[model samples]
Target chain A: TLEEIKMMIREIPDFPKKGIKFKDITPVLKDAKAFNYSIEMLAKALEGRKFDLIAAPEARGFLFGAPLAYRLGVGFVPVRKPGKLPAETLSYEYETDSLEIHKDAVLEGQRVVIVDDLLATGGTIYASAKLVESLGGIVDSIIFLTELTFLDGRKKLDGYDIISLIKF
Target chain B: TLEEIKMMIREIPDFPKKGIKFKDITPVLKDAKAFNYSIEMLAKALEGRKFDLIAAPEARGFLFGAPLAYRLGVGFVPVRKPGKLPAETLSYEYELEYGTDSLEIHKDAVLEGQRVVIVDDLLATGGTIYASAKLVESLGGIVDSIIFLTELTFLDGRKKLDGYDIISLIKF
Candidate 1:
C-alpha cells in the first residue's frame, strides 16, 4: 500500500534550490485514502511502543503528528520555531536555526515519540528530540512518513529508535 | 465539558507585541482529554454538515484541521504562506504590511461545486480566513462554513466574515 501512497507524492525538481528534488507531500494530504493510509502506517509502526506524547515540528509535521496522536490517544506537543510558542520554552540549536518547546510540555521521566512528515537531513527532528530530552523526557522513538536515505539522516540520530514507512 | 477545556487555556499578557493579550492554547493541546474534547466539540458543531474537504491555514490550523479531517472522513488541504506549497497555487492577498500579506492554496486542490469547511485555531482579525475563503471560491469550491476553536469577539472578526456561517467554541 506504500506504493499507492508513494504514487501520490509529487517530485518537483530544483525546488527552493537547484539540483535538489523536493518530495512534495501535499498530494498525499489532499487525497483522503492516501492521507489516511499514511497515518495508519505510522500508527501501525508504533504499535508496540509506549509513549506519553507525540512531539512534532511546525507546519508539515503537524499534518501527520496531530492525526496520529489522535489515533493513538496521546497528547500532542508542538515543537515550533522561536516566538511561536507563547510560554517559557527551552531552545535547541541545530545547524543554523533553532527549535523550541514549552518548558512544561514534557514532564520528568515521560516518554515521547517525535513525528514528522519527512526526514531529509534529520536536523529538525534531532533538535526536537533534544528539546524533549532537556525537559527530562525520554525519546522513545522517531517516526516519519518518508525518509531520504541518501541524506543519511540516520547518522545524526544514532542510538535512537527510528521508523520510516517509505524510504527513497 | 467545554468549560473544562477552557480552564486549560493560559492567558498571557502582551505576547508577540505590546498591549496584546494572547490566549495560549498549548496547555489544552498538551493535555490529552482537553485536546480530544475540543476536537469533539468542533466535530459536534458540524454534525449534520456535508463537506468534501477541510481547508486550513498553516501552521496552527494544521494542528486542528488534520485531526478533524481524519475524524470526519474528509481530505485535508493546507493553505500556506508564500513559497511553501510546491505546485501551481492560487494566491490571495489580505493585507499590506510594508509589503503585502498573502496566503496560497494549491490550484487543483478543490473541485467545482465541492463544499469545504475552513478551520483555524483562533479567529482574530479574520483577515486570514477571509482570504482563505476567497481562494476556495476562486477554485469554484463553495465555502460551506468556517470554524475556529477560539474567537476574539472584541476584534469584531465576525463583521468582516459576514454572510459566512462562522462557528467558534470559545469566545473572549
Candidate 2:
C-alpha cells in the first residue's frame, strides 16, 4: 500500500519558485496512520541491509532517519548545514555553499546508511557521503521517501545502492 | 535512567555565539539504547495527556518529535522558519535588536479544538515553544503539554510559560 500512502502526500504546482512542481510531504506526516505506514515501509525496504550507523543531511532527513535509527538500534549522526554543529566538523561544497559534518560523527571503517526525504539533484546527499568517507566510514546504502527519477539524481550518485519508496 | 541519558548528551561551550554553552543531543541519538530510552521516557512523562497532533520547530525539534509522534500514534507537524512551509501559514513574531523573528505553521496544520503537544531539545528562554503554541492556538488547538529534553534552570523560562504543563527530562 505504498502507493496508497503516496496518494496522501500533496503536490503543489509552482511552489517556492515558478514552473517547479513541489511534492510536499507534510500531509503524509499529518495523517498519523499514513505517517506510521511510511516508516514501516521504509524499514521493510531496507530489510537485510547491515549498517553500523545512520547519517542524514539536516532538517527533513531527521524526520524519517531518527526514528529508523531508533527502530533499527543504530546510532544516528547528523550531517548539518554550516554553523549548526557545536563541535569541530568537516565541510563540503553544494550549490556554491558548504555543509558540515561533525568530525567525530563516524569512525574509520564503520558502515553507514544515509537517509533523506527526497532525492532531486543529489547534491546534498552526495556531499554528505563524502563527509562520511572523509572519516573512512563506508557508505552501505542511501534511502529516500521519494525520488524524481527523471531528474537522474541517480546519475550523480553512480556506484551506490539506492532505494526509494516511491519513484516519480 | 533519565539522568544516565542526560550524562550521555555532549555539552559544548561558546558555540554559534560566545557565552552560550550549547547542549548537543547528538550523542544520545548516536547511542541507540539511549535514544530509545529518551523517547520512552518522553512518552511516559506525558502519560494520561491527550493530543491530536505534535508540532515542533524545525531542525532539532524534528529529531525527537517525529519519532515520538509515530510512537504515540499521532500526527506530527512542523513549525518552520519563514519561507519554508509551502502552503498558506500563520506567523508569530518575537523582537530582535534590529528586526523581528518569525515562525510559521501551515494554516490548516491544526484543526479547531484539536490538542497539540510541543517538543524541543532544549528550553533556554522558552521562546521557540511560545511561537509554536501561538500558531497552534490561532488554529484553535489546545496545547496539551510542552516537553523539553533538558532545561537551563538558571534561565527562568518558566515564568513566560506559566500556563503550560512543562516537562523536562534533565535540569541543568
Candidate 3:
C-alpha cells in the first residue's frame, strides 16, 4: 500500500526555485482511496504510542495532521505562522520567518505528536516541537508523510522519535 | 448538533484587522468530536446529492473538504493560490485586484460532465466559491452545491450563489 501511495505522488523539478525538486502530494490527495490509505498507514505506524494531542504547522501540515488527529480521536492544535493565529500565539524560527501557535494550545505536561506533509530540512518540525514544548507540552513524536533523507534532515532531530511514511 | 457545533466555534474580536470580529473555527477543530461532527453534518445536508468530485480552495478549505471527500469516496481537487499547484495548471480570478491573484488546479483535474461540490470554511462574499465554480465549469464540470461552515448574512453572499444549493451550520 505504501508503494502504491508513493506511485501516486508526483515529483516536479525546479519548483519555486532553480535546482529544486519538489514532491507534489497533490495527486495523492486527489485520489480519495489513496488519501484514505495513507492516513490509515500513518495511524498503523503509531499504534500504542502515547500522546494526548496532535499539532501541525500551517498550510500543508494542517492538510495531513487534521485527518490523523481525527482517526486517533485526539485534539489538534495548529502551530501557525506569525499573525495567523487568533489568540496570543507564540512564534519560533523555521525554514521561513517566525512560526506561531496559540499560547494556550498545549497544557502543562500534555503529551503531543506533531504531523506534517513532508520533512525536508527538519527546520519546520524542529521549530514546531519547540513551540509545543514552550506551551508545556511534551513532544512524544514527530511524523511526516515523506522524508528527504538525501538532505540528511534527520540529523538535526537527534534523539527525537521521528517517523516518516516514505523516504527518498 | 448544529447548535453544539456553533457553541464550539470561537468568536474572536477584531482579528486580522480592527473592527472586524472574526468567527474562528479553530476551537471546533481542536476538538475531535466537533471536527468530525461538522464534516458529518455537511455530508448529511447533501444526503441525496451527487458529485463525482470535491473541490476546495487552499489552507483552511482543505481542513474540512478533504475529510468530506474521504467520507463521500470522491477525489479531492485543491483550488490553490498561484504557483502553489505544481503542474500545468488552469487559473481563474475572483473579485480581487484585476483579480491580480488567482486560483489554479491541474489542467486535467476536472472532466467534462463530472459533478463537483465546493466546500469552504466560510462564505465571506461568495467570491472564493464563485471562483471555484468557474474553474470547474471551465473544464466542463457541473457545479452541484456549495457548503460552508458559517455564513455572515450581513455580507449578503447569498445573492451571488442564488442558483446553487447552499448549506451552513450557522448563520450570523
TM-score for each model:
0.98, 0.97, 0.95
Computed on C-alphas against the true complex, the DockQ of each candidate is 0.79, 0.79, 0.65
Give me the runs in candidate 3 sitting further than 4 Å from their true place: B96-100
Against the true structure, what is model 3's DockQ?
A: 0.65
* Residue B45, model 2, lDDT: 93
Which candidate has the highest lDDT of all?
1
Instruction: Report how far off residue B51 is in candidate 1 (Å).
Output: 0.6
* lDDT string, candidate 3, A107-151, tens digits: 899999999999888888889999988988999999999999987
Query: Which has the higher TM-score value, candidate number 1 or candidate number 2?
Result: 1
Query: Chain A of candidate 3 scores what in TM-score?
Result: 0.96
For each of the candidates, give the backbone clash count. 0, 0, 1
Better of 2 and 3 by TM-score: 2
lDDT of 3 by residue, B1-172 (tens): 8899888778889897776788878888877788878888988988999888889998789888877887787888888888787778988877842444578888878889999999999987888788888999999999999988899999878897778888887888
Q: Candidate 2 lDDT, tens digit per residue, A1-168?
A: 788878877888889899988888988898888888888888899899889999999888998998778778788998998988988888999779788988888889999999999999999989988999999999999999999999989999998899999999
Which pairs clash in model 3?
Answer: B97-B100
Query: In CAPRI terms, where does candidate 2 land?
Result: medium
The runs of at least 3 residues in candidate 2 whose Cα sits more than 4 Å from the true structure, single-residue gaps closed, are: B95-99
Q: What is the Å distance of residue B40 in model 3 from its true position?
A: 1.7
